[PDB]
């Protein structure tokens, strides 16, 4: 079976209580301590509000969970607790539930974000480098803690642009990496699904997040959102194969002893690899450098084992100036 290149044994060496989220005994706080103020966003599994702690008067984020199995809620809480206070990770403060409806809410430290549909079209070259580097800090940290996010996308990256603060949010799809485990492939969101999810390679690992990051990065530097625009999970692989080419897909399927369903094989067809330079135009040229292309190229590989790790990405020349600005302090 496939195994992670890095952080392979993190959860083998940690005690069972670290990763056994199903056994979690949730310590419920006071539902009355937090009041909603205004709605911030919506999702398939929750609605997110700006709130206030009525005692301290501090602002918070209140995430009200739609009905889901207890095991899934315990998974998100356990992971949030295990990552609490890590770099650029959203910070869980409290867990409460309504005593009549039993609906649970997760309480987070407040983040004053700007929606990516407004922010990304105004991001400069340096800000793309800065924010992707900040996101890589979050991914290297959570991966080092034995956790895959499995839903990296612009909506789950809250950026406070005036403070230049970034938080990786919504850990409701995240899982613990266990070497040798076959995971559910119905994770992430369509446009950011790695080829492993689309070809039924279940023994995937942290590198799934690095594919999703590459999709985000491509969307930013080419001003093409989303970059891989599929209309369903099968079409999503078609859109990928029309860019990366089918030769390396076929090699990938052979290496892992996979074959496409005949219905999917007909859709994928045969395609040459398209050079990244084909996506440059006058409107986005100021964001595309040789270094940006090389970095993107090393993220978007069919073979998850060939993708940069978060640490390798941070070391790429594309971030040279960001690292220097950070080193100076």
Residues that bind Cl ion (CB under 5 A): 143, 184, 206, 309-310
Closer residue to Cl ion (CB): 11 or 113? 11
Closer residue to Cl ion (CB): 174 or 260? 174
Which run of H or E residues covers position 62?
strand 59-65
Which run of H or E residues covers position 130?
helix 125-144
> Annotated catalytic residue: which of 94, 151, 205, 209?
151
Number of H helices and E strands in the chain, helices first, is: 13, 9
Closer residue to Cl ion (CB): 49 or 295? 295
> Binding site annotation covers 165?
no
Is residue 152 within 8 A of residue 191, CB to CB? The reply is: no
Look at the alpha carbons of 106, 21, 192, 121 in this order and tell me if their dihedral is positive or negative. Answer: positive
At closest approach, how far in Å is the CB of 183 from Cl ion? 7
Residues 6+ apart with CB under 8 A from 44: 66
Closer residue to Cl ion (CB): 193 or 253? 193
> Binding site annotation covers 311?
no
> Binding site annotation covers 118?
no
> Binding site annotation covers 40?
yes
Closer residue to Cl ion (CB): 72 or 223? 72
Closer residue to Cl ion (CB): 5 or 242? 5
At closest approach, how far in Å is the CB of 281 from Cl ion? 32
Residue 215, both tokens: 């999709």
At closest approach, how far in Å is the CB of 6 from Cl ion? 5
Q: Which of 51, 30, 26, 25 is closest to 99 using CA atoms?
A: 30
Look at the alpha carbons of 83, 89, 94, 96 in this order and tell me if their dihedral is positive or negative. Answer: negative
> Binding site annotation covers 48?
yes
Instruction: Let me know if 297 is a catalytic residue.
Output: no
> Binding site annotation covers 137?
no
Give the helix, strand, coil percentages of the chain, each rounded to 5.
Answer: 45, 15, 40
At closest approach, how far in Å is the CB of 36 from Cl ion? 29
**Separation between Cα atoms, residue 14 and residue 7, nearest integer Å:** 12
* Rg of the chain (C-alpha set): 20
> Binding site annotation covers 43?
yes
**Separation between Cα atoms, residue 45 and residue 173, nearest integer Å:** 10
> Binding site annotation covers 45?
yes
At closest approach, how far in Å is the CB of 268 from Cl ion? 26
Residues 6+ apart with CB under 8 A from 24: 74, 77, 78
Residue 98, both tokens: 């309504």
| 3-state SS assignment for residue 273 | coil
At closest approach, how far in Å is the CB of 150 from Cl ion? 8
Residue 190, both tokens: 């369509």
**Separation between Cα atoms, residue 305 and residue 86, nearest integer Å:** 26
Cite the annotated binding site for ATP by residue number: 40-48, 63
Q: What are the residue numbers of the active site?
A: 151
């Amino acid at each position: 079976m496939s195994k992670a290149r890095v952080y392979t044994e993190v959860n083998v060496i940690r005690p069972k209580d670290y990763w056994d989220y199903e056994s979690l005994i949730v310590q419920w706080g006071e539902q009355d301590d937090y009041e909603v103020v205004r709605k911030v966003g919506r999702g398939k599994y929750s609605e997110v509000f700006e709130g206030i702690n009525v005692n301290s008067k501090e602002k918070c984020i209140i995430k009200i969970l739609k009905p889901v199995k207890k095991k899934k809620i315990r998974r998100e809480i356990k992971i949030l607790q295990n990552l609490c206070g890590g770099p650029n990770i959203v910070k869980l403060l409290d867990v409460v539930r309504d005593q009549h409806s039993k609906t649970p809410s997760l309480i987070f430290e407040y983040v004053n974000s700007t929606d990516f549909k407004v922010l990304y079209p105004t991001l400069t070259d340096y800000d793309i480098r800065y924010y992707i580097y900040e996101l890589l800090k979050a991914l290297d940290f959570c991966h080092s803690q034995g956790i895959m996010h499995r839903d990296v996308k612009p909506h789950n990256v809250m950026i406070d642009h005036e403070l230049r603060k970034l938080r990786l949010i919504d850990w409701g799809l995240a899982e613990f990496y266990h070497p040798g485990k076959e995971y559910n492939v119905r994770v992430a969101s369509r446009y950011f699904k790695g080829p492993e999810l689309l070809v039924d390679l279940q023994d995937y690992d942290y590198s799934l997040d690095m594919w999703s990051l590459g999709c985000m990065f491509a969307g930013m530097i080419f001003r093409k959102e989303p970059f891989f625009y599929g209309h369903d999970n099968q079409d999503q692989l078609v859109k990928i194969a029309k860019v990366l080419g089918t030769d390396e897909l076929n090699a990938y399927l052979n290496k892992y002893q996979l074959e496409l369903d005949p219905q999917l094989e007909a859709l994928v067809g045969r395609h040459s690899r398209k050079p990244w330079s084909k996506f440059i135009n006058a409107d986005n040229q100021h964001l595309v450098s040789p270094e940006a292309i090389d970095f993107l190229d090393k993220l978007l590989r069919y073979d998850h084992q060939d993708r940069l790790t978060a640490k390798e990405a941070m070391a790429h020349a594309y971030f040279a100036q960001v690292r220097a600005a950070e080193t100076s302090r």
